[PDB]
Design a protein around this ligand. Structure first.
Ligand SMILES: Nc1ncnc2c1ncn2[C@@H]1O[C@H](COP(=O)(O)OP(=O)(O)O)[C@@H](O)[C@H]1O
Ligand SMILES: Nc1ncnc2c1ncn2[C@@H]1O[C@H](COP(=O)(O)OP(=O)(O)O)[C@@H](O)[C@H]1O
Ligand SMILES: OC[C@H]1O[C@](O)(CO)[C@@H](O)[C@@H]1O
Ligand SMILES: OC[C@H]1O[C@](O)(CO)[C@@H](O)[C@@H]1O
Ligand SMILES: [Ca+2]
Ligand SMILES: [Ca+2]
Ligand code: NA
Ligand code: NA
Lengths: 308, 308
């Protein structure tokens, strides 16, 4: 029974990824959708709550999630607003590679009544787009508070996309409020430095010390990940691959991480955490092997073969 | 000198058109953009005024128009809003084939100061999306009034896309206000019946009689076009083709029509009008031969070869 449900909330998105001159691949995406699918592919128990648009992209994302055996009972169609649609520039990476065409998209209209019943020991994973505008911002903070209240665990990956914020001057403080609520926080190197105003990972980690975050993980691209827990920092690294498409690699990482925490007896244990990050690294690498955030999210047969 | 400038205003759009499973063609589109390019390809003098987004789709549409030798001096980038992005379903046709992902897109924020200087004898062509929301609605009606004031001519093609209207209950009356301002109005059969609440072209034309519109043209798909001028109705038809893609065929039609009116000594003359509609029909047919509204917009060598 120790396989705990992981709830994902936020933006399911169609990522339009160049593939041939004059053509886009229609790729399912959206960071929390990506994480959900990553966990399901590893045979985990994931479930999504949020809003997409009542449009073909929204229906495509519902179909995708259900095909991937992600529970979508709590994925709702907004009656007015459209599904997020993102154009990817493959000459860039991460935030710089995305243009958001729909602002505010349906997910930004998440309401308190959209939040499902949570149980002790469950996980909730959130990214910063969910915090970008109201009412999703306040609804998502309420979801976090409710998960904490019931004795669940909260994972946060800022996954910064500034252009989504109608008030970008609110990003830093709003994101850092969520960082202070979380049990697990994952940053890219650049995101940690940006949110703390620092020029190195060392200074960045010192700047978040007072938050007393139980587990911080800083991805280092090819160099793997820095795992920071109380009074300990350790780099965990595996095989570097040449990425074909970096889109969503950090979400694959989170997916492997949370899958392994979710099936642990006691996720707080250092051995469990380090192993979970080993899986995260393998997932992140494999995810880069095909275009589309979800396309090469691995199953266990593939991951074990790669980690061996 | 008798080649008069035709001004086009409204929405330049990226149309995402299925082409292979999992792929979209990235096709330039937007009815008034289509009309502009149709006129330019026939060696006419066309110019566009309006707003796209400060984004890659907006820049792509600017590039497209300038490549097609459409004057874009007055195409501006909106600082906030995104370029219209439309998903096409090729199992449907016309309005029913389009899903608008960006609402309100940049073009809906057309301001009075975006209107260029007009001169006597020039043409202005408008479609109903320009009237869908404020401030574009009032700005566009002002542009129409200014063109009338200076002794130019106004062309209107409702080109109905209801979903773009935040207040769809305003569509009928707003559209019909523009119909009453125009020198030339082009309807599809279905659009004429919808806007007049009638069940036939005959009743539809009777219902707009009091408007005293100088030239009404009703397209009849494969059967060509009905040309209604005072006390006269005449069907003009040419070679029917099997359409490969109907997207924008009605805009190609308008393009050929207005190109020929724009180069006429006296466009009011029945011979000039009938010839212009013959060109319109040929353009509409040829436009269907490739995917994308603009792709097969013909040049004169192609059109003459087809009409012969
Ligand atoms: N070149 C690489 N080789 C091996 N693993 C990688 C490589 N790049 C990324 N990863 C894995 O994915 C994580 C971050 O990748 P990233 O490119 O930032 O993806 P994304 O930006 O979409 O989140 C790293 O922690 C690592 O585990
Ligand atoms: N099957 C056809 N054969 C010949 N001409 C056509 C055909 N279909 C459309 N046209 C031309 O284009 C016009 C309308 O086509 P349509 O399919 O409604 O294009 P759109 O809906 O994009 O405006 C007609 O008036 C006609 O001149
Ligand atoms: O993490 C990658 C994902 O992040 C997004 O930019 C926003 O959710 C998506 O476009 C992409 O799939
Ligand atoms: O007339 C066809 C054109 O009309 C639109 O639906 C709206 O402007 C575009 O998507 C398409 O190119
Ligand atoms: Ca990321
Ligand atoms: Ca039309
Ligand atoms: Na991928
Ligand atoms: Na075409």
């Amino acid at each position: 029974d120790s396989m705990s449900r992981v709830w994902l909330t936020g933006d399911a998105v169609v990522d339009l990824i160049p593939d041939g001159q004059q053509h886009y691949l229609k790729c399912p995406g959206g960071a929390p959708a990506n994480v959900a699918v990553a966990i399901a592919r590893l045979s985990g128990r994931s479930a999504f709550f949020g809003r997409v648009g009542n449009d073909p992209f929204g229906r495509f994302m519902q179909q995708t999630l259900t095909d991937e055996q992600v529970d979508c009972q709590h994925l709702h169609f907004d009656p007015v607003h459209r599904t997020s649609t993102v154009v990817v520039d493959l000459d860039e990476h991460g935030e710089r590679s995305f243009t958001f065409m729909v602002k505010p998209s349906a997910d930004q209209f998440l309401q308190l009544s959209d939040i499902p019943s949570f149980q002790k020991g469950e996980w909730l994973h959130v990214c910063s787009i969910a915090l970008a505008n109201q009412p999703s911002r306040s609804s998502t903070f309420a979801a976090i508070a409710q998960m904490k209240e019931v004795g669940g665990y909260v994972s946060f990956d800022p996954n910064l996309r500034e252009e989504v914020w109608s008030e970008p001057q609110e990003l830093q403080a709003t994101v850092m409020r969520a960082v202070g609520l979380a049990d697990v926080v994952k940053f890219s190197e650049e995101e940690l430095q940006f949110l703390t105003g620092t020029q190195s990972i060392e200074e960045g980690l010192q700047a978040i010390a007072d938050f007393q975050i139980p587990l911080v993980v800083v991805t280092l691209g090819a160099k793997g990940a820095l795992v920071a827990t109380p009074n300990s920092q350790q780099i965990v690294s595996g095989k570097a691959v040449k990425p074909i498409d970096t889109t969503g690699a950090g979400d694959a990482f989170v997916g492997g991480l949370l899958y392994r925490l979710s099936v642990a007896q006691d996720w707080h244990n250092q051995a469990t955490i380090l192993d979970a990050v080993k899986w995260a690294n393998g997932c992140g690498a494999l995810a880069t092997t095909q275009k589309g955030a979800m396309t090469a999210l691995p199953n266990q047969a593939a991951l074990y073969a790669f980690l061996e």
